[PDB]
Each structure stands twice: as C-alpha cells, then as structure tokens.
C-alpha cells in the first residue's frame, strides 16, 4: 500500500506472489493483471514479494486492450482466494484472485466493480468502496 | 512579534468605514490592523488569535474565532483583555471577516461582536459607530441562516425592545449610508476578492452577493427613516448613479433571481418615495436596464426566471403610470422588447402572472400601448390553449386557470365586439370540456365559479345527455 492508505491494515495471509495473474474486476477494458511488485514489501534473500487483499501492487496488463498493454500501472487487490483469518476468527476466501487499476494516489481508472470485494480493502481505499457493488 | 509600519496609510487619511482613527475596509489589501497596535494588545493569547485570523486558510481562521469566543464567554476573568486596543483591532478584522465566503466565519464573527456589545455595554460607545453598521449589514444578508440568528441576537442584546432596534436605524443612518456607498462605489469585484485565488466568475458572484446585501440594507433604511432622502441627498445620488447597483439586473446569468428581485424592490420604493421621479437621470438608467432584462428572459431559462416575472410586470405597470407611459418612450424598441417578453412569458405560467399582465393592460389602455384586437387577443387566446393542453396536470393549475378566467373576462368586457365574445364562449367551452377533472377539484370549480348565464349552461348539459 503505502501513500494512499486510509488507516492501517491488519496482517492478511499473503496469497499473490510476484508473477501471479489475477482477474481484472473493473470496466477499464483490461482482462487480467500480472503482478510484478508489491508496495511496502520487505527484503529477504530468495523471498518473493507477495500480495494480500487490500494491497497496492505494480502490474502489467497481459491480456486486454493494446493501450493498456505493455506498460506498468498500479493496481489494488480486491479478491484473494487464499484463506485468511480475521480478528473475529472466521477463515474466509473468495474463489478467484481479482484486482482493479488505479493511479499512485489510489483513485480507480475504471468506474464499476463486478463481483464482491473485501471489507479490509473497502475500508482502506474509499474509491474502491465507492465503485464497489457488494462489500463482504 | 509584529513588525513593520503602514507608512502609505498615514498619507491617505481616509478611514473608510471607521471613525476611530483606524481605516476599516472590505478590500483584502488594506485596512489590515497596524503592526504597532497589534503589539499593544494586553495578552499574548490575544495576539496569537490575531495572527491566525490573518492567515488565509479557513480551518485556521475558524479555530481562532472559536478560541476568541471562548475567551469572551468567560468575560469576568478576561475583561482586562478586551480593551480599546482590542476593539480597534477587532473592528478592522471584523469588516474583512463578514465578507468571507465561509458562512461559519461570518456567523461566528457576528456572534462575537454582539457578545462584546452586551458584555462591555457603555464602554463600546466610542466604537458603536464602527460596529453597528456592519452588524446590521449581516442582519440584512440574503442567506437566511446568517441573517436570522444575527437579528435575534441583536434584539436580545437590546433587551428585546423593538424601539431600540428601530432607533439604531435612525441614529446611525448616515453611517449606514456610508457603508452602502463604499460597497457600491468604492469597491470593485477585484478589490473584494483576490484574483490569484479566484476565477473571473466567483469573484463576480461574491461581489454581487455583497452588493445585494447593501441594497437590502438601503431599502430597510429608507423604510425606517422617513427623512433620509432629504438629509442625505448627495450621498444617495452617488450610490444610485453608479451602474453597479443596476448591473445586478441581469437574468442571462446568475444563480438566483433573489438579488434581481431586491433591485426591483428598490426601484419600486424609490418611485413611491418620489426620488426616481425627482431625479430623472437615475430613473432613466434604471428603466432602460429593466427593459434590457426583459430581453434576457429566454426559453432556455424560463423555468428558472418564472417566479420573478410577476414582480417585473407589476413594477412596469407602476412605472408606466408615471409620465403617461414615459417609460416606454425612453427606449425606441421597448414595445418590441415587451412583445417578445410576453411571448416567452406566456409559455410558462406562474402564480400571479396573469394579474400582472392585466395590470399592465390597465395602465396601457388609456395610452393604447397594445392593439386590443390585433395584438392583445392573440396573446390571450394562445394562452388559454396552452393552459388547457397541459391541464390540469400541474398542482396549482386550478389557481392558474382561475386567474386566467378572471382576468380574461375583464379584458373581454372592454371590447364591445363580436369576435371577443365569440372567443370567450368558445374558449370557455373548450376549457371546461377537454378539461381534465375540473369539476372534481371542488376548489377549482369554486374558484372558477362561472363564465356565462346560468340557464344556458343547463342547456349545454342537456345536449351532452342528448348526444349520441
């Protein structure tokens, strides 16, 4: 995350390392996002920088519209599909990995989100919560 | 702590609103408190409050006002703090604050001054001349939220005596006029608001809101003081002559017609007083601008400008009476403007519009402004047709139709011609017959009590039953 964080986030189990391809949930014309970096990740020998729900990543559009391909852009993870624990102790997970496109300040490139988003992401990014249909 | 000298000000020797040796002015650039006086303040706390008020950001200004208010609220402990020096400085800053874009700043400033007057009563006498006009300007501000609380507080300050409030208008009337002059003549949109931080618009919007308040104040001053015209004629002339008051009469652009309405009231009040008749140039300038306004109303803005239209026509009727329709004579194309205005206005009817139209006709008929048959009737007929088609779809339609009938019926009476009589009957029948549910709205039926002899209406009912 980093700059555009609205508050802090509890540790969510990391599910999306570098090289992961997730679905592109918004209506910006991109089909999938390919994660090349995680904002705020630490440094360890041989350890891959991994992303969780609500994290801001750097991503490229591998499949989609040609004006979105072949460049790096920030993205926000909204669906994780690797099970994580909340402080009320429910273990929950979606069925796919999904993110949306944003600028470095966090406002969405698109306008609407298809499918659910996590509340740990909706609380942390208000534009995602603004364009989100259902928040769970 | 505070450094620098206002050397330029010393040469000028104009105190603007102030009468206590400190210039008090609305413009951002000047009238700022002198550095030396600021140092003289009794406590450090007060000085910091003043620096914050000077800073541009609103959150900072508001926080300082909140602090000042708290200090005033605890008056007994802090009475030493508020001295003549504080009052002189406050007076200079208060003027700038009341013109502030943010309502909270405006409201708090007004509340604070009133508290000072209540707490320091009889010691603010020297400063009453500076403070009172500004307080009143706030009580006559278009926004209800700023004005109503301010007035209530003022009344409370004077122990709920109506006489005292009225007295204030009388006692400081010369000063109140000076404030109006300063806003209208001395100031310009640029002077009031900084160009760097504002657009060409907004700066205009702000000036207009402030000037509207000045006009409202002027109207109030005139009503309160009977002899104001005679005593302050020279000052009144300069304020009236300037086009700034008149520039407000533009309906092409602008958020509200409330400001425009205020100007109309002023013209009417001046006519009632006879100042407008007395001074021809002011009257002509006002009249020409009013005529121009008629052109401004257009199909695109008809919905927005509809409430103000009954008022515009009523003023015109009163003006026409002066000088035997002299007002139309001033402009060569005035008749054309009126005709155009009527055509645009008829399409959308607002409550009271028809009465105004009839009033205009009544004033004009003696001098034959509009041809009764060639010109006026077409206007009337088209109007009823329009009314019926969108009928009674809207709410108050019942009232609007009722009005048309009462007015048209009067117009028809002064005809003595068959076509007019024929039109009346045919239109009436059409209006009732296509109708909507005229009978069903009892009020509508009551208001539209009748249009013809009783027996004939019965014969028509007879035909409906007799019909195939």
């Amino acid at each position: 995350s980093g700059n555009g964080a609205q508050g802090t986030k509890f540790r969510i189990s990391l599910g999306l390392p570098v090289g992961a391809i997730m679905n592109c949930a918004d209506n910006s014309g991109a089909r999938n996002l390919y994660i090349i970096a995680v904002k705020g990740s630490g440094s360890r020998l041989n350890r891959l920088p991994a992303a969780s729900l609500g994290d801001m990543v750097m991503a490229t559009v591998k499949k989609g519209k040609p004006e979105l391909r072949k460049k790096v852009m920030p993205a926000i993870v909204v669906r994780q599909a690797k099970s994580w624990r909340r402080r009320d102790g429910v273990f929950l997970y979606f069925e796919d990995n999904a993110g949306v496109i944003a600028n470095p300040k966090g406002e969405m490139k698109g306008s609407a989100i298809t499918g659910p988003v996590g509340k740990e992401c909706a609380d942390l990014w208000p534009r995602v919560a603004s364009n989100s249909g259902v928040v769970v | 702590s505070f450094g620098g000298i206002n050397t330029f000000q010393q040469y000028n020797t104009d105190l603007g609103l102030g009468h206590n040796g400190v210039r008090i002015s609305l413009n951002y650039f000047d009238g700022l408190p002198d550095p030396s006086l600021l140092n003289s303040l009794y406590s450090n706390e007060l000085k910091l409050i003043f620096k914050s008020l000077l800073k541009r950001d609103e959150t900072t200004k508001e926080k300082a006002l909140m602090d000042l208010s708290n200090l005033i609220s605890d008056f007994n402990q802090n009475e030493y703090f508020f001295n003549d020096i504080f009052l002189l400085c406050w007076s200079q800053i208060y003027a700038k604050l009341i013109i502030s874009d943010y309502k909270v700043i405006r409201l708090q400033s007004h509340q604070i001054t009133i508290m000072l007057v209540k707490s320091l009563r009889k010691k603010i006498s020297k400063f009453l001349k500076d403070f009172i006009p500004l307080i009143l300007l706030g009580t006559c501000e278009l926004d209800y939220s700023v004005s109503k609380p301010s007035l209530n507080e003022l009344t409370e300050c004077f122990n709920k005596d109506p006489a005292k409030i009225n007295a204030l208008w009388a006692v400081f009337q010369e000063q109140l006029l000076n404030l109006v002059k300063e806003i209208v003549v001395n100031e310009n949109e640029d002077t009031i608001s900084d160009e760097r931080y504002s657009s060409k618009e907004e700066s205009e919007f702000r000036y207009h809101r402030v000037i509207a308040s000045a006009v409202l104040l002027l109207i109030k001053l005139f009503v309160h003081n009977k002899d104001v015209s005679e005593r302050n004629s020279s000052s009144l002339k300069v304020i009236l002559s300037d086009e700034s008051i008149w520039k407000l009469l533009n309906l092409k652009n602008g958020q509200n017609t409330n400001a425009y309405e205020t100007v109309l009231r002023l013209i009417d009040v001046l006519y009632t007083r006879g100042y407008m008749p007395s001074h021809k140039n002011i009257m002509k300038l006002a009249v020409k601008k009013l005529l121009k306004s008629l052109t401004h109303i257009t199909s695109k803005n008809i919905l927005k400008v509809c409430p103000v239209l009954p008022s515009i026509l009523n003023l015109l009727a009163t003006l026409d009476d002066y000088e035997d329709g002299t007002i139309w004579s001033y402009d060569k194309s005035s008749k054309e403007k009126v005709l155009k205005f009527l055509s645009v206005s008829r399409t959308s009817p607002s409550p009271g519009f028809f009465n105004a139209v009839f009033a205009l006709y009544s004033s004009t008929k003696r001098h034959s402004f509009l041809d009764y048959y060639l010109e006026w009737l077409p206007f009337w007929q088209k109007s009823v047709q329009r009314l019926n088609e969108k009928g009674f779809s809207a709410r108050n339609s019942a009232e609007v139709l009722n009005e048309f009938w009462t007015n048209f019926l009067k117009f028809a009476e002064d005809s003595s011609e068959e076509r007019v009589k024929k039109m009346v009957e045919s239109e009436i029948f059409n209006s009732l017959s296509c109708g909507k549910s005229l009978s069903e709205y009892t009020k509508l039926n009551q208001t539209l009590s009748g249009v013809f002899p009783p027996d004939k209406w019965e014969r028509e009912i007879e035909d409906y039953f007799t019909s195939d």
Binding site: - | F8, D14, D30, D194
Partner: protein, 104 residues
C-alpha cells in the same frame, strides 16, 4: 529625500511580511486614490532582486524610470549609476586604442 521616503514606505510594507501581489494591489489602489508616494512608483516591481523603479521628472512633464535598490541608500544608487558611467568610458578608450591597428 523623496526617493528615501518611497523606500521607507515600501520597506515598511515589506517588514510586515506582506504578500508581494497584495503590495502591488495596494500601490494600484493608492495611485487611484491619488497618493503621491504611490504615484511615483512603477508597478512591475522587482522585489525578487530587492529593486523598485521610480518616476522622476526630467525637467524641474516628461518622466524617466530609474531602478533603485532597497538595500542601499539613494545616494549609493546614484554612485552605482556613476560607476556604470565610469566603466563605460574606459571601454571607449580601449576602443580608441583599438581603432588604428584594427582598421589597418
């Protein structure tokens, strides 16, 4: 002396930590209201290099525009203009020494 009065006025406005554009607007308003000290000034102010410019009558109706440093006295600015005069003369003498051998 009147230049020193204008300098003291502008420096007093500067020492209030007032914004430069608001100072220029204050100069324009006082010129409109007929203050002599304001009307002696030219409005594109070089406060970034601590320099003002002032109108002086050529005959004791034509006016000349002269730049005055705020950090030096008026007499010291006059000595700087004299110094720029004196440096120009030496270059002219160097040109006169140049002319014969150059044109040959």
């Amino acid at each position: 002396p009147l230049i020193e009065e204008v300098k003291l006025a502008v420096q007093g406005l500067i020492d209030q930590q007032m914004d430069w554009n608001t100072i220029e607007k204050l100069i324009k308003s006082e010129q409109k209201k007929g203050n002599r000290i304001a009307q002696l000034l030219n409005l594109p102010l070089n406060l970034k290099q601590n320099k003002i410019s002032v109108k002086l009558d050529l005959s004791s109706n034509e006016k000349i525009n002269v730049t005055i440093d705020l950090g030096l006295s008026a007499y010291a600015n006059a000595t700087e203009y004299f110094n720029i005069k004196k440096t120009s003369a030496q270059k002219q003498k160097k040109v006169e020494k140049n002319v014969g051998k150059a044109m040959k």
